[PDB]
Every structure is written in structure tokens, then in C-alpha cells.
């Protein structure tokens, strides 16, 4: 039982989310270039800073995000970008159609083996959920509008913007999957798992830093 308001809120988010387009001269670099660790780190940097450009140009389109504290709305992206990059990469790695090449480049880009194992454990775990593109898009928007983010002053104001998305996603889990009432519970469990990755991601950067060169935009979100 979805409403026409939710249906039009889902429609906006989806077409806001399907507008993501990996530029051709980056996506073809994955195969055409060599797999040296420095070259792997170079490509991964470009994809990261590009998806951040994608991410801001999908977040500002979120209904009501612009109507918030300038300092707090900035804080949302600071704490949601890593989790939204994990969620977008998890979708591409479990999509059925080059995923295998990028994985090899991530594994051979200078990351400590302490962070590889949880990363692909998460990717595998997300894959078993068999999420639709609607669930990936709503989950990304839910992840951004989080009330319990750090350095947040108006926590109650964010609640008003998140609750409807959770309301929409919860209906979809009950509508499209009645043969499994834990699908919604397992969906929300991934946001919990993303927090772990978000917080021990700066250590992954640290190892990458004590060795390289980040873009100013990437330095501007991850505090480098």
C-alpha cells in the first residue's frame, strides 16, 4: 500500500540516483592501463574524487537537504561519503554484467590486508541480500540523512528528513518481499556495518598517507 506521495518521492530519488555516470576516460582506464600499485592508487583516486562530485550532485537534490544549517549540512557529507562510496561500490561489484578488474586493482593498490578482508566480506554480505536498485538508492539517501552524525547540532531536524525515506523503504520491503520479513531488518543492519568501515577508514588512509598524493576534494572530506 504505497501512496502517490511516496511513489513520487521514490521517483525523484531514483532518477536522481540513476543520473550517475562514470566518465568514459576513467572507466576505460581500469582495463587499458597497467596494474602497478602506483597506477592502481592513481585510478582509485580519480574514481573516488569523481564519485564525490557525483555524491554532492545527488545529495543537494535530496528533498529538504538545502534547508539546513550550513555547518551541519556540511557535516553530513563528511560522515556519509565513505559509507555512500562503500554502498555504491558494493552495487557495482554485485551487478551481473569490469567488476573483476577493479577488485584486482583495489587488492593491488597498497591497502593493508587488515582492511581488504572486511571490505570484501561486506561486498559478499551485501550480495547475498540481492538488493534492487530502488533499495540501493534509498539506502544511500538514508545513509546521508543520519540524525546521529557527529558534530550535528539540529539532530531532531534531520529526523524529519530521514523518517520518510525509512518509511518508503520499509513499505517496499513489505510489498516486494513478503516471503522474507527479515529483509528490511538485514537492510538496516548494513548501515550499522558501514559505521565500522567509516570510522576505521581514516586508518586505511593513514597507511596510504604514510608512504602519496590526494586530490584537494578528497583531502577536504577525509581530513588530510
Amino acid at each position: 500500500e504505497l501512496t502517490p506521495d511516496q511513489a513520487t518521492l521514490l521517483h525523484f530519488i531514483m532518477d536522481s540516483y540513476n543520473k550517475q555516470r562514470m566518465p568514459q576516460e576513467i572507466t576505460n582506464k581500469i582495463l587499458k592501463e597497467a596494474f602497478s600499485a602506483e597506477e592502481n592508487f592513481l585510478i582509485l583516486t580519480e574514481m573516488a574524487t569523481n564519485h564525490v562530485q557525483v555524491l554532492v550532485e545527488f545529495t543537494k537534490k535530496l528533498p529538504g537537504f538545502q534547508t539546513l544549517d550550513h555547518e551541519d549540512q556540511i557535516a553530513l557529507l563528511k560522515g556519509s561519503a565513505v559509507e555512500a562510496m562503500f554502498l555504491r561500490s558494493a552495487e557495482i561489484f554485485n551487478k551481473k554484467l569490469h567488476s573483476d578488474l577493479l577488485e584486482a586493482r583495489i587488492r593491488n593498490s597498497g591497502i593493508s590486508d587488515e582492511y581488504i578482508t572486511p571490505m570484501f566480506s561486506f561486498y559478499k554480505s551485501i550480495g547475498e541480500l540481492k538488493m534492487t536498485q530502488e533499495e540501493y538508492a534509498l539506502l544511500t539517501a538514508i545513509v546521508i540523512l543520519s540524525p546521529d552524525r557527529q558534530y550535528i547540532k539540529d539532530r531532531e531536524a534531520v529526523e524529519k528528513l530521514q523518517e520518510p525515506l525509512l518509511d518508503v523503504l520499509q513499505k517496499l520491503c513489505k510489498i516486494h518481499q513478503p516471503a522474507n520479513p527479515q529483509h528490511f531488518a538485514k537492510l538496516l543492519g548494513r548501515l550499522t556495518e558501514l559505521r565500522t568501515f567509516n570510522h576505521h577508514h581514516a586508518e586505511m588512509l593513514m597507511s596510504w598517507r604514510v608512504n602519496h598524493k590526494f586530490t584537494p576534494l578528497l583531502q577536504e572530506i577525509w581530513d588530510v
Partner: peptide, 11 residues
């Protein structure tokens, strides 16, 4: 955090 505010509120 200049570029994020700059990349925000754009036509």
C-alpha cells in the same frame, strides 16, 4: 571545506 560548499548551491 570550501569546495563542498562551492560544489553545493549550483545551478
Amino acid at each position: 571545506h570550501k569546495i563542498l560548499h562551492r560544489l553545493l548551491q549550483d545551478s
